[PDB]
């Protein structure tokens, strides 16, 4: 007869966006999809062997290195006071989203504090302007689950000093997303948002902002933070963001429970 | 007069292994080193712009992808029961080294549990033998600090099924380290150790071991776990491992406090 809701959920797991009601029973539909998914994993294993999340990180890395940005690898486990100094006190939404570790540490919910410190230190060593970026894990306790992950990967890039303009910031964003092949629209110190439909890809800022002084920053700057899993979701037409996460349930958006 | 211990520590920070007592005061020696380090950072920023830790990860990644290993990106924040199922009860050294998060989670001290699960799931989809690997952050509370980091990066590779022999395992290790240009010696189920002097680069294992059954593994296997920061330390002749870590104090083994 008709498919139960549980059967439909089971098939949805095995379903890729590329796949194409009938007089066909669950057993057959499931067996067909199981076959298709196994071949997909076999093809990856025979040919490229690269994880989508790792591969995107390498592509994004090459992009910013080529455009003059220095690659940063900063701590993921950061001091808890970095949170307070970011202006995240107990009345903010983010205050309740912090994964605390021990008494004095936590998991970074963003790349800003570490990059802030790098900007200050590199100013004493590097010529104007100063262009840096980081790609790495970030952690937020989230109530949602359709566009949100508690463990996700963020890309943040910053330029400091000369040429820190709204137009320049939009140009970098535009070149970047056109390079990846991801459609977007920008929605407008100056705080921007990069949208794909009703999905937020990025939040860009045109400094200076009054927060800079706490970190010893006294120059103009432009910056943006992207989520790699959201980028993957859009690029690969994944219906749920969990298909793009670090996961034991999905490899390259393919179910591992076959 | 003579340099104080504090002055010597300060200069040691500014010192690279390549640099070469005299009638020279601290102010001058420090000013010289500050000059040399700034130029190093300027050279990186003008030329390559790549972080040593990220770059090594990409090189290691290319190595194993080319030799038939599938790239894994699994969760860093893992269920706490994975620790108990690894055979780490409250009488082991590792039990006291776990960074717990919330009631039911922790930071992975190793890549084994996630890779164990991937081995089981991929067996139902992939032809013999099954070759996978992962590179990512790992966390252990450590009392030492000269060869140990609390936040470090691990490389683990595994082959399952055919050809899982001591000789084959040693061949992969040998090809790998000769590719990187890192001198070593192997010290001998079968548990191996890859040493650089008195520094442990890796611990390799030739399965099966009785632990496999808890993870639903019933085949022969070979595997090894490397620390990327230790690899960097040896390769770059860093005297302390903190020069190779995710850090706000060092970029590519160069002090950021100039
Ligand atoms: N929980 C999450 N899962 C996946 N990606 C995220 C998450 N939180 C933030 N991001 C990504 O990081 C980028 C920058 O972080 P930011 O603080 O700007 O987002 P946010 O407004 O908190 O996200 P949202 O409003 O969608 O929860 C976002 O554009 C988004 O792509
Ligand atoms: N705290 C740490 N800092 C840096 N690297 C580490 C650390 N712990 C383990 N590693 C690396 O991971 C590899 C595999 O982990 P393993 O559990 O085998 O090491 P270990 O015996 O606990 O290390 P050690 O005896 O030196 O503390 C090691 O060969 C080492 O290079
Ligand atoms: N919002 C992202 C990107 C950045 C904005 C400002 C700086 Br400084 S980094 C983040 O917090 O990482
Ligand atoms: N010791 C390292 C490498 C591995 C050994 C066995 C497996 Br399964 S992975 C680790 O625990 O990741
Ligand atoms: Mg949010
Ligand atoms: Mg935002
Ligand atoms: Mg140890
Ligand atoms: Mg060991």
CATH number 3.40.1280.10 given to A50-258:
no
Q: What tokens were used for A239?
A: 């219906």
SS3 A244: coil
CB of A169 within 8 A of CB of A192? yes
Q: At CB < 8 A and 24+ separation, what contacts does A14-21 make?
A: A14/A255, A14/A258, A16/A40, A16/A253, A16/A254, A17/A236, A17/A237, A17/A238, A17/A239
| Distance between start and end Cα atoms, chain B | 24
Which chain A residues are closer than 8 Å to B99 by Cβ? 77, 101-102
Instruction: Decide whether any atom of ligand 1 lies within 6 Å of the A134 Cβ.
Output: no
How many Å apart are CA B84 and CA B95, to the nearest integer?
Answer: 9
SS3 A162: coil
Among candidate residues B152, B126, B124, the one with its CA nearest the CA of residue B138: B152
Find all residues with CB under 8 Å of A96, minimum gap 6, and list them.
A141
Q: How far is CA B120 from the centre of its chain?
A: 25
**B168 burial level (CB within 10 Å; 0-12, 13-18, 19+):** middle
Indicate yes or no: CB of B74 within 8 angstroms of CB of A44. no
Task: Identify the nearest ligand to the CA of B135 by its number.
Answer: 4
Indicate yes or no: CB of B248 within 8 angstroms of CB of A44. no
> Residues with beta carbon < 5 A to ion ligand 6?
A 203
In angstroms, what separates the C-alpha of A231 from chain B's closest C-alpha? 16
Task: For residue B229, report the distance from its CA to the centre of ligand 8, in Å.
Answer: 15
DSSP H or E run through A26: helix A26-46
- Residue B73 has its nearest CB partner, among A48, A53, A70, at A53
How were these coordinates obtained? X-ray
For chain B, what's the residue count?
258
Torsion angle defined by CA atoms of residues A146, A151, A155 and A161, in that order, rounded to the nearest 10 degrees: 110
Resolution stated for this PDB structure, in Å? 2.7
In angstroms, what separates the C-alpha of B129 from chain A's closest C-alpha? 11
Q: Which atom of ligand 4 is nearest to the CA of B138?
A: 12
Q: Is B146 on the interface with A (CB under 8 A)?
A: no
Beta-ladder partners of A60: none
Write the secondary structure of chain B as one string of H (helix), E (strand) and C (coil).
Answer: CCCCHHHHHHHHHCCCCCCCCCCCCHHHHHHHHHHHHHHHHHHHHHCCCCCHHHHHHHHHHHHHHHCCCEEECCCCEEECHHHHCCCCCCCCCHHHHCCEECCCEEECCCCHHHHHHHHHHHCCCCCCCEEEEEEEEEECCCCCCCCCCCEEEEEEEEEECCCCCHHHHHHHHHHHHHHHCCCCEEECCEEEEEEECCEEEEEEEECCCCCHHHHCCCCCEEEEEEEHHHHHHHHCCCCCHHHCCCCCCEECCEECCC
Find all residues with CB under 8 Å of B171, minimum gap 6, and list them.
none
Which chain B residues are closer than 8 Å to A99 by Cβ? 77, 101-102
Q: Is A99 on the interface with B (CB under 8 A)?
A: yes
Residue ranges covered by each domain of chain A: 1-49, 50-258
CATH number 1.10.3720.10 given to A1-49:
no
Instruction: Note whether A1-49 and A50-258 share their fold.
Output: no
Task: For residue B171, report the distance from its CA to the centre of ligand 3, in Å.
Answer: 44
């Amino acid at each position: 007869p008709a498919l139960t809701k549980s059967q439909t959920d089971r098939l949805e797991v095995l379903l890729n966006p590329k796949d194409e009601n009938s007089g066909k029973p669950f057993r057959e539909l499931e067996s067909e999809l199981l076959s298709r998914r196994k071949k997909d994993l076999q093809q990856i294993y025979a040919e490229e062997r690269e994880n989508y999340l790792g591969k995107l990180e390498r592509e994004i890395t090459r992009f910013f290195v080529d455009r003059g940005f220095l690659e940063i690898k900063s701590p993921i486990l950061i001091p808890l006071e970095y949170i307070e100094r970011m202006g995240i006190d107990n009345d903010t939404e983010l205050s309740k989203q912090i994964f605390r570790v021990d008494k004095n540490f936590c998991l970074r919910p963003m790349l800003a504090p570490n990059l802030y410190n790098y900007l200050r230190k590199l100013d004493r060593a590097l010529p104007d302007p100063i262009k840096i970026f980081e790609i790495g894990p970030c952690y937020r306790k989230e109530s949602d689950g359709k566009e949100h992950l508690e463990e996700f990967t963020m890309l943040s890039f910053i330029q400091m000093g000369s040429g820190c303009t709204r137009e320049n910031l939009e140009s970098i964003i535009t070149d970047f997303l056109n390079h990846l092949g991801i459609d977007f629209k920008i929605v407008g110190g100056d705080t921007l948002d990069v949208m794909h439909g009703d999905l937020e890809l990025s939040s860009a800022v045109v400094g200076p902002i009054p927060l800079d002084r706490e970190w010893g920053i006294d120059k103009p700057w432009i910056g943006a933070g992207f989520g790699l899993e959201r980028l993957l979701k859009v690029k690969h037409d994944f219906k749920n963001i969990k298909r793009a996460a670090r996961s034991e349930s999905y490899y390259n958006g393919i179910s591992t429970n076959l």
